[PDB]
Write a sequence for this structure.
């Protein structure tokens, strides 16, 4: 169970003559290649007066610590963000980078927003760096967060998260030689090796219909064709 | 006694030298040229800065031609376009049809603000060179005298009578036409004010940019506006000043020969280490550290105990000696690739004095002199 | 002094198809490397009917010197913005990026708001221009303008803006030779010349850990690391 | 001043040496191995008891 409740706070960056704001954020983790972001907020969703719900928030909105259902306390990156789960002290929403999380009041003609900057390091750790999750294609290494509560925080995880792609290479096996007729509509990191004993350590980024011939040992080869983790082919002769 | 020594223009590094006078051992002389300023006379040709294009509303004459009248705006350009607008409705409203005639006029001025982002075009005629010559004579005290490198004004100062015969090289920050921004100084030619260059430096010219009553060329080309709007559209060549500021591949500032901070005073070369400076120092006989008085130097040896290879003053060495009469003898090296830190050494009967030196050699071989007596110091680091 | 009267002016976009606004920005100076803006408005700020004030402006809209409070007519980015000084026909304000300034009345259904996209200009002041204020480094001289009026346009000035700094040229001393391992975190201009008998006429733009070796004669050398004016070392092992 | 020497693990003869430096008289170096602990990192395979 959470040990803290929302409060009015001086924002790190808010509009001048409005910096005396309600609704604020503490820390955010966005180190994930996941589209979801784990928030430690002080403008908390997943806290009503009763604690943890999945579609309710609480805030001190220049008022007092009290709750209503999601309406006036909005997460944003700078554009809307749709929450996924609320877990008391920690909130989970998708606001992909997690370096800018904005809690803002979007009523009346005025646009009030407090935005909090965070100390996230989002780096490669996969086999390639890639686009945030869409719905389409095969995943790639990420460091997602849990998408349900346990009531205090959401836990850190490493898994694999969705990535866009285009039709996979037309492979042709022939005498000790494998041509990959490629049709990326999207930048793919192409990594190769033979899987026999031939090294072929070949990275290249490809896009557009092109061909890339590779040697084979005749004992398979891996070509990883971006937005997939290693794909491998084998045969008596490849 | 007037004593003429020549100090290499080492900025910040004091040059040890000996004052020889007949039958009298040397006088501590350390000369540091603190600053050399080549300052030439500047006749300001023009200001140039970030322009703002100003579009005034165009003169449309209903039922007749519009003649252009020249206006004193800096890159004032007009073009007369006839039959631009039909009678009434879209475009100009007029009783007459294609007798509507537009003068499409526009011009450039200097921006609202320009005094921090502007260059100054100067014709430059021949200058004066000042040298701040710090001459120490007798014992450590670091006296210094501004003295003209020119013949015009020799220092008749009390800190020795100093004449600075012209520096062997005194860097010229000028040719004839120099543009100074002072963040990038260029010897850069331009046509004299009233005639500029279009879309190259002198894109704006003035001589005090204030907006209007400036002279510009920037290759302003008015376009003809398609009917339904009355305004003056234009294309123009890129800003020559902005192009010029970015023309830093190594400005006048970075090509300075022995290194000089080419600077906007209006155009001068600051802090030059250029050349070697003739120094006439009047060291009175009263400030001598002579052998024929209390100094007597005999049996001199240099031992280097330790050294840092070719360092600022990372050399530590000791000069052991014999004196018949104890005195104070000037420690020195006449080198310009090596200097001794101190310019005095307490010569004594059987003393040892550890002196700090600088050399430009891994194995430091500098000629060390106390008084009139010389030794060579070597390696042993 | 200021005495150039308030006026109305057409602003490209207000309301939906509204454009008949006062308070409309005509010109902008962005000479600052900071997020401050010098604004030229049709409406005169810093003058009410009482003459010169510090927190009132005046405008026409059917008037000629009618005034309101600087909070009634409120500047904004996408959140309120508070002006700092008025110099008549010109406003000078702090508005979070200083690259988007919207002066607007969000009073009633007719909502006139003018926005002009303002700018930050970086120009040489050392031997190179420099980036916007960050956490890193310390303030240096920048291009700017006066941030208080004279009792009509604000005048240019050099003021101080935080420079992005990162490790300066890490000199490595060797036998009268200096290799300069420099480690920017930001685009820095490296200018050199020797201050020994030699010279090293080299402008180069650098980013990130690199080396640039230079000759010396045992008589110093200059490295300017742009945003500063010349820095000099003289006959160390230089 | 760095002087690099190698001392025999002998307490019979503790290994005496002189440190020379130019323009100086040498430095006392007597080196005695008082104790030796050869300590390797151990990964346990199994217990028997």
């Amino acid at each position: 169970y959470k040990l803290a409740r929302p409060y009015i706070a001086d924002c790190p960056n808010c509009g001048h003559s409005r910096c005396d704001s309600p609704i604020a954020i503490e820390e955010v983790r966005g180190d994930a290649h996941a589209g979801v972001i784990r928030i430690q907020t002080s403008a908390m969703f997943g806290l009503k007066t009763d604690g943890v719900d999945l579609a309710y928030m609480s805030f001190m909105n220049g008022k007092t610590q009290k709750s209503i259902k999601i309406d006036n306390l909005h997460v944003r990156t700078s554009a809307p963000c749709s929450l996924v789960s609320h877990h008391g002290y920690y909130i989970l929403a998708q606001c992909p980078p997690g370096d800018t999380v904005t809690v803002g009041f979007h009523d009346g003609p005025n646009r009030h927003t407090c935005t909090v900057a965070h100390k996230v390091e989002f780096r490669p750790v996969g086999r390639e760096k890639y686009r945030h999750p869409p719905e389409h294609g095969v995943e790639l290494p990420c460091n997602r967060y849990t998408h349900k509560r346990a009531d205090v925080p959401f836990v850190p995880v490493k898994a694999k998260c969705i990535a866009t792609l285009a039709p996979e290479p037309l492979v042709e096996h022939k005498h000790r030689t494998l041509i990959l007729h490629l049709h990326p509509d999207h930048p793919t990191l192409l990594t190769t090796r033979s899987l026999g004993s031939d090294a072929n350590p070949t990275r290249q980024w490809i896009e557009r219909p092109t061909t890339v011939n590779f040697t084979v040992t005749g004992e398979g080869l891996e070509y990883t064709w971006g937005n997939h983790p290693p794909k491998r082919v084998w045969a008596q002769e490849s | 006694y007037e004593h003429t020594a020549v100090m290499p223009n080492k900025v910040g590094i004091p040059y040890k030298a000996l004052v020889e006078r007949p039958g009298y051992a040397p006088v501590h002389l350390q000369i540091q040229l603190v600053n050399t300023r080549i300052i030439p006379s500047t006749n300001l040709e023009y200001i140039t800065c970030k322009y703002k294009t100003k579009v005034p509303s165009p003169v449309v004459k209903c039922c007749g031609a519009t003649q252009c009248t020249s206006k004193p705006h800096p890159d004032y350009q007009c073009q007369v376009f006839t039959g631009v607008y039909p009678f009434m409705w879209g475009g100009a409203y007029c009783f007459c049809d294609t007798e509507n005639t537009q003068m499409s006029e526009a011009y450039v001025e200097r921006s609202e603000e320009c005094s921090i982002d502007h260059a100054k075009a100067y014709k430059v005629h021949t200058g004066t060179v000042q040298a701040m010559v710090n001459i120490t004579y007798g014992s450590v005290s670091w006296r210094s005298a501004d003295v003209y490198v020119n013949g015009e004004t020799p220092a008749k100062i009390g800190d020795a009578k100093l004449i600075i015969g012209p520096l062997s090289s005194a860097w010229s920050p000028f040719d004839n036409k120099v543009v100074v921004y002072g963040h990038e100084v260029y010897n850069y030619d331009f046509p004299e004010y009233g005639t500029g260059k279009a879309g190259s430096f002198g894109d704006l010219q003035s001589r005090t940019s204030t907006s209007n009553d400036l002279y510009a060329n920037t290759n302003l080309k008015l376009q003809r506006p398609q009917a339904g709007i009355v305004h003056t559209p234009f294309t123009q060549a890129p800003s020559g000043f902005e192009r010029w500021k970015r023309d830093k591949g190594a400005p006048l500032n970075d090509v300075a020969p022995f290194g000089c901070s080419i600077a906007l005073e209006p155009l001068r070369a600051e802090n030059c280490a250029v050349g070697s400076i003739p120094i006439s120092i009047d060291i009175p006989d009263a400030a001598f550290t002579r052998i024929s008085e209390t100094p007597t130097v005999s049996d001199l040896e240099c031992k280097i105990t330790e050294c840092t290879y070719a360092s600022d003053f990372g050399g530590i060495a000791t000069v052991a000696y014999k004196s018949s009469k104890a005195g104070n003898c000037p420690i020195h090296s006449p080198s310009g690739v090596a200097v001794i830190k101190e310019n005095d050494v307490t010569l004594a009967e059987s003393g040892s004095f550890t002196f700090h030196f600088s050399t430009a050699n891994i194995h430091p071989a500098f000629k060390l002199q106390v008084c009139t007596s010389a030794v060579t110091c070597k390696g042993d680091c």
Remarks:
- The radius of gyration of chain D is 19 Å.
